[PDB]
UniProtKB/TrEMBL annotation, chain B:
Family named by the database record: Belongs to the acyl-CoA dehydrogenase family.
Signal peptide location: none
The name this protein goes by in its record: Dehydrogenase
SUPFAM superfamilies the UniProt entry points to: Acyl-CoA dehydrogenase C-terminal domain-like (SSF47203), Acyl-CoA dehydrogenase NM domain-like (SSF56645)
Residues that hold FAD according to the record: V126, Y128, T129, S135, L161, T362, E364, Q368
Top-level division of the source organism's lineage: Bacteria
Cofactor: FAD
From TrEMBL, chain C:
InterPro entries: AcylCo_DH-like_C, AcylCo_DH/oxidase_C, AcylCoA_DH/oxidase_NM_dom_sf
Name of the molecule in the record: Dehydrogenase
Family: Belongs to the acyl-CoA dehydrogenase family.
Domain of life of the organism encoding this protein: Bacteria
GO molecular function annotations of the record: acyl-CoA dehydrogenase activity; nucleotide binding
Chain residues that bind FAD: R226, Q297, V301
Keywords, alphabetical: FAD, Flavoprotein, Nucleotide-binding
Residue ranges occupied by any Acyl-CoA dehydrogenase/oxidase C-terminal domain in the UniProt entry: 197-316
Origin species: Streptomyces ficellus
């Protein structure tokens, strides 16, 4: 199992990290910690570097770095805490849909169950509420469930029965008998190992890996400067040990996130089916556990703008469960694994 | 061992519950509850509570109390939080600053300063932490240079709560500097309007904001030095030890677990995935309630067991943090959009949670205290 | 609430503690860590102190001490690591049944699911397997389930279809269509708040509390004598902090176990009364696992050998933590009761 | 990067797998598996593994190896445990004592000692820990006082595994007492048959027992002090860091998770277990990658203590968590019937406490990780 580094990804990451270090970070301690949606302040950096063509393969005139490039982009966006202007477009692009839409509804499991599509009259209607990753009054891509079938549905703004929950963060969209046709179905969201859903989960897992890594960096540095009882905080075992444990989880998360992207790219070019679930569920738990520990290690300053941790703290609140609760993702992964042990 | 309350206690408790549920108090509570990063003025609410005689029932009558036992005041504290009253001001004014004055103040200082606190007309913050002295409180640098009979105060206090709404500050200062780390420390009750005081806000992720307090030769009367001069370090930790019960965190965890159950029950049914957590948290809540009253029964008899107090603080604050983290994921997207009342308190709970294992002694300090019982 | 110690019980604990310290402990590192069953080596000391009469009321000829005394006995039995000759005869006595049998089948939730009783003409037929708390080849008290009704069945030592697995510990009983009649039913095993199951759960919670407590006692003691890098183990934050966390869990467990015992006793004389036995059991099962893992780490390799005596509590928690059901499963039962109370409130 | 293995690596794996699935091997594996507190003799199995040339495929051919890359020996180690081979004798003899003579031994000592190890004819164990020297290994008081060009060793070594079955003991001794804590220390390859050696068992809850080794003026030839005299302390640390991969714990966790799935699968329909199965299978996936991350680097001369400590910690802790959970999975009938899964998981529970203590404790792994926080090349 060769794990030595690839130059092409190394350049990509270096160019993202340098470019994103310029992006201005939102200065509040309340309200949204980032500007989300396809048109955030990091959108400019991504466009310059041609992020639209990263996952594009050798065929059809694309860079040819596969999902792994998408995972690298998402990790650096999370690390910078500058917002994610990439995930919604990259989901749309993987299905041939035009950009510009917020995506919503991934938090429910089974996939799409927060917005149910009922066959009624001579039609179908969407009913439920969903969390959005972008502006809730714009166009939407909704994970919806029709008769047990998980589907991604395009909804144009101002549609009947659609109300936008603006002002809470993340934003929320509500559907009261919002009508849809089979023409609005952008694609299916099944568990195929290389489908749009699996790619979407690995991008989100990489984002959570970035957010968690970014918070750890702050705590490790602040524990190196701050002194109490004439010792660096980092020389206190009750501080160093939790930061070290957070390091293990970050490296364990890196391992399954990149393994997941590599398996997907190998299939485009055994335990393959649950790799996206695995990557997302351990990243969501890792982000939650790393952030708790970082807040405690940095004391009351972690809750104030003296540090910068408050941005990652607010992000983990909204992002750790955006694509499903870890406990539920694990049960899906465990069911699949127990299936294999039965046949 | 009686795991439960007498009939006399529950008659008291239900009277206090009724007093807290009049239309006037409910209106004041609603105008005063912090949410969405906002920290409203609650002085009008606290005056209503003072007028009803509920702020310091355990204090002597000469100071505005009712001379009830400490356990009657825990009943009141529990019912205060269960009625929606924001309790940070009560904890800081009555349970820390007021308690210190009763424990270490002269009969004059108690007369001159305590009655307004018991009536809800004046309030006090706690000004110990300094930029270089958090867990290591003995590294404080604020100096109290004598000035005739009085003193002037220079230093910086940071991370206190409610300070821009309060009138008094309990301040730790070096009266005799250079006499050692844990020597020559004194406690002063500082008027926050006095010259040279600069209160300002450090933004905090939570609803209630932190504060920086600036003392530039702040003049303080000699009668405003509480307790024996230069004996502040043993007095200060004696007082912190008496205030440690875990009850305040128990009631947060209770409020937050009940809010999550309300959110769950306000949405159409079995909720199979939440059942284990609801069970464990309810069980740990019951353990935490007993651990808190284990401290109060001991305090009421006049014995201060610092290990037991440290157990209760650790268990309740870690429990309250765990409940806040899990409960914040329970309201559905529709409930967040519509600002269901439980979604609002749970959003606040999440952003309060990190502080619980840090205030009034960190989790790590509690474990250190606990290690002395070996 | 007032939690000052009861003087009559402080004496009762002291008397149990010193008499149980006179019972030799099993000397091996392999095999069963205790000899339990109704007549193991600590039966004499319990008989001498009249423990069999602690719970029965004064009017029935007992000492009227209640389930609280039963909990004290069980905790002190767990701390001693001398085996448990109380639990099965207390369960039987709470149902008017004479003693001497091993109790089995508690590990299955819902109650009795590991032994299903299917209706026959003159009774039922039992099929399943079950963990016993005593000799699997003796008389038995089996938690079984007839059509969703949980019941306790008395089974004679050589009943047909009954196979005793005595190789393992804890020992196991298998039934292959073993036949029982309505006369063999000792009593129902319902979820009633002061019912036999609820008392049996509280006794098991107390037993786990004593096991964890005994284990923690020896790790704290060892951490005080063992030195490395010229400091006491207890003076190294990485060892002392896990030992201090275990103490928190032990105190939390003591709180719910004695709250539950006192609430059952209250209702026997005179919010969430129904779930208290589950709360106590589930906290004690998780506390025992968490405490013992921490004690083993804090003492190093010696924890794994007869240099310390931790190894007896270690094997005990392996068997006892789940003998009355998995904690997550107990917690879900507690959770549904709480959520159902919340659905009613709205 | 490339997750997964070369087609050439998969072909070599399949031949190892087939070689370990013969009647001769499976019969011997059955006879040598520790279970129920009994630790059987393994010498016959390991003779047979040496005959098959599987014990040290990456050693030089002069010394019994087959001149293969280190990653090829990792593939063998994987398939040895997946075929039931008890591996502690292999880890102590080939992966610790054997690796250390390769790294620090002369031609004279390499040639006299290595071949019988590669053939499974002779075995060694590690004699470092003392009654007052566990974590604080520099507190060791064993003394090697000179005797001509040889030495006489007096001390007490405790908590080694397999010792009453082995021939050689890698023993740390002070060749110069009074030289300061971490100075004056040398390593000896002690012949455990020599006069003055008394080996006895310290009973432990695990299947495999601990040992006490008493050394009373035991003679040690001068050509058996391996490495530079008195430079023993650095050599032990270098050897330990090179040894640390997490592969051995990864394989215990994989065995135990698979035993628990076997137990569950052979039983009626488990919503309780699904989450544990999921998290444990994902953490195993992460742990396989971390382990092979350190082997890849070791294969390329790169030594990196922090990544090796991460892998050791993650894998040992996971194996403990898997053993604790999975011990409750077999139901009473399976325990009564001695379902092989139940036997394996009963062993696993009693083994688990040692994993976060052997070859560096979990606390020392965290200390090594904090080392990264003071490095400028952190990111
Ligand atoms: C909600 C809240 C309210 C507060 N209110 C007030 C107030 O009213 N008045 C006031 O004066 N102050 C107040 N404070 C300040 C508070 O007392 C400090 O946060 C606290 O003393 C710890 O300081 P710190 O946050 O700087 O942590 P640091 O001292 O920087 O410590 C950082 C981390 O290291 C750990 N640590 C530190 N030393 C050790 C050690 N020796 N061993 C092991 N671990 C160690 C700590 O536990 C913590 O996790 C408040 C804080 C909070 C969070
Ligand atoms: C399965 C197994 C196999 C072994 N095989 C061998 C062998 O072949 N040869 C051999 O020589 N030895 C062997 N050992 C011994 C092993 O190396 C020791 O267990 C270990 O080196 C020292 O731990 P200890 O048990 O003495 O614990 P202690 O040193 O008493 O430590 C007690 C606890 O405190 C922690 N601790 C100690 N010091 C510190 C510190 N400064 N900071 C933080 N935490 C600290 C430890 O991590 C541990 O958790 C084996 C042990 C095991 C479990």
């Amino acid at each position: 199992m060769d794990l030595t580094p690839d130059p092409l990804l190394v350049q990509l990451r270096g160019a993202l990290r340098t470019a994103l270090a310029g992006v201005p970070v939102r200065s509040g301690v309340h309200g949204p910690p980032v500007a989300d949606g396809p048109s955030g302040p990091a959108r400019e950096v991504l466009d310059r570097l041609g992020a639209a063509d990263f996952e594009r393969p050798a065929s059809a005139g694309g860079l040819g770095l596969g999902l792994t490039a998408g995972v690298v982009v998402a990790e650096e966006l999370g690390r910078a805490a500058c917002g994610n202007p990439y995930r919604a477009d990259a989901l749309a692009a993987s299905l041939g849909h035009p950009g510009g839409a917020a995506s919503a509804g991934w938090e429910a499991l089974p996939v799409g169950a927060g917005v149910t599509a009922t066959a009624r009259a001579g039609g179908w209607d969407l009913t439920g509420a969903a969390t959005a990753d972008g502006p809730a009054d714009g166009p939407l891509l909704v994970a919806a469930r029709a008769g047990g079938e998980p589907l991604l549905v395009a909804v144009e703004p101002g549609a009947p029965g659609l109300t936008a929950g603006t002002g809470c963060w993340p934003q929320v969209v509500r559907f009261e008998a919002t009508p849809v046709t089979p023409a609005d179905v952008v694609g299916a969201l099944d568990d195929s190992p290389t489908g749009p859903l699996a790619r979407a989960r690995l991008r989100q897992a990489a984002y959570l890996l970035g957010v968690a890594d970014g918070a750890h960096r702050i705590a490790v540095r602040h524990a190196g400067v701050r002194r109490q009882f004439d010792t660096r905080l980092r020389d206190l075992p009750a501080v160093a040990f939790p930061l070290a444990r957070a390091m293990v989880a970050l490296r364990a998360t890196r391992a399954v996130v990149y393994r997941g992207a590599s398996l997907v790219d190998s299939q485009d070019a055994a335990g393959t089916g649950t790799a996206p679930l695995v990557a997302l569920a351990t990243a969501a738990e890792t982000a939650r556990d790393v952030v708790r520990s970082c807040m405690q290690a940095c004391g009351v300053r972690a809750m104030t703008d003296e540090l910068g941790l408050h941005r990652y703290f607010r992000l983990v609140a909204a992002e750790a469960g955006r694509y499903g609760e870890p406990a539920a993702l694990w049960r899906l992964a465990g069911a699949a694994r127990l299936d294999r042990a039965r046949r | 061992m009686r795991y439960g309350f007498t009939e006399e206690q529950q008659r008291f408790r239900a009277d206090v519950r009724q007093a807290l549920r009049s239309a006037e108090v409910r209106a004041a509570v609603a105008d005063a509850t912090p949410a969405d990063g906002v920290e409203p003025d609650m002085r009008t609410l606290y005056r209503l509570l003072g007028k009803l005689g509920l702020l310091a029932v355990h204090w002597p009558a000469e100071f505005g109390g009712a001379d009830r036992p400490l356990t009657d005041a825990a009943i009141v504290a529990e019912e205060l939080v269960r009625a929606g009253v924001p309790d940070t001001l009560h904890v800081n004014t009555i349970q820390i600053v007021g308690q210190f004055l009763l424990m270490a103040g002269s009969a004059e200082q108690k007369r001159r300063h305590l009655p307004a606190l018991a009536q809800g007309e004046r309030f006090a913050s706690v000004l110990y932490t300094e930029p270089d002295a958090g867990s290591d409180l003995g590294a404080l640098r604020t100096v109290a240079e004598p000035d005739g009979d009085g003193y002037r105060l220079t230093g910086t206090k940071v991370f206190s709560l409610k300070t821009r709404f309060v009138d008094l500050g309990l301040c730790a200062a070096r009266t005799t500097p250079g006499a050692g780390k844990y020597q020559g420390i004194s406690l002063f009750l500082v008027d926050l309007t006095a010259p040279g005081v600069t209160v300002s806000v450090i933004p905090g992720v939570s609803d209630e904001q932190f504060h920086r307090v600036d003392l530039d030769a702040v003049p303080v009367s000699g009668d405003d030095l509480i307790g024996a001069r230069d004996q502040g370090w043993p007095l200060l930790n004696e007082a912190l030890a008496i205030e440690r019960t875990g009850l305040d965190y128990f009631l947060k965890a209770e409020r937050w677990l009940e809010a999550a159950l309300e959110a769950l029950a306000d949405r159409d049914p079995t909720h199979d995935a939440h059942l284990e957590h609801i069970g464990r948290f309810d069980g740990a809540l019951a353990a935490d309630h007993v651990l808190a009253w284990e401290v109060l029964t001991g305090l009421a008899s006049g014995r201060v067991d610092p290990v037991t107090a440290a157990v209760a603080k650790y268990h309740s604050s870690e429990l309250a943090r765990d409940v806040a983290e899990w409960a914040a994921g329970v309201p559905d997207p529709g409930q967040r959009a519509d600002r269901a009342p439980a979604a609002v308190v749970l959003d606040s709970a999440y952003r309060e949670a990190p502080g619980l294992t840090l205030s009034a002694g960190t989790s790590e300090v509690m474990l250190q205290i606990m290690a002395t019982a070996f």
